[PDB]
Design a protein around this ligand. Structure first.
Ligand SMILES: CCNc1nc2ccc(C3=C(C(=O)O)CCC3)cc2s1
Length: 166
């Protein structure tokens, strides 16, 4: 958990303009969060990037988890290996509001972070899930009580988030 270059937004939420794969490789945190779907198919966005950085080891492990346990629920999570990126990966399913999943479930999704004292994470339901990223940061601040280090790849989005918050 050798985090550096973060800006503290609240007592427990930190933010950085960084690629989450590069942060994970540098810091080797105890927990990296994946923005997953219910079948843990890591095809694009942050999930595709983390899986590619494990050279598809995350996808083979995820398929075995699904074969034995079934899919996750929207707002749910599971803990799997973090491979070369972290001790553990917490796979969390935010709602896909573009497909009619309820935005109320974004609070349930962020509640999974509270089971871990320190996490490196992306914003949930941003990107192809369709939630407004600034609303997702507000839900993170209002819900997460443990220490979360958020990595935002896009500089234009990062500047917008820091301006709306601090
Ligand atoms: C080059 C490998 N690293 C990465 N590939 C991506 C792809 C998408 C993203 C996304 C967001 C983010 O900053 O969390 C919000 C919307 C999609 C981030 C990354 S880091």
């Amino acid at each position: 958990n050798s985090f550096s270059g973060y800006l503290k937004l609240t007592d427990n939420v930190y933010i950085k303009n960084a690629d989450i794969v590069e942060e994970a490789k540098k810091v080797k945190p105890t927990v990296v969060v994946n923005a997953a779907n219910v079948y843990l198919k890591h095809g694009g966005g942050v999930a595709g990037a983390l899986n590619k950085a494990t050279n598809n080891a995350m996808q083979v492990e995820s398929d075995d988890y699904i074969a034995t346990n079934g899919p996750l629920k929207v707002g749910g999570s599971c803990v799997l290996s973090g491979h070369n990126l972290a001790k553990h990966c917490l796979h969390v399913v935010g709602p896909n509001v573009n497909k009619g999943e309820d935005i109320q479930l974004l609070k349930s999704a962020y509640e999974n972070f509270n089971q871990h004292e320190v996490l490196l994470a992306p914003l949930l339901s941003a990107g192809i899930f369709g939630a407004d990223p600034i609303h997702s940061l507000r839900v993170c601040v209002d819900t997460v009580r443990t220490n979360v280090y958020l990595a935002v790849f896009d500089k234009n989005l990062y500047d917008k988030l820091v301006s709306s918050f601090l």
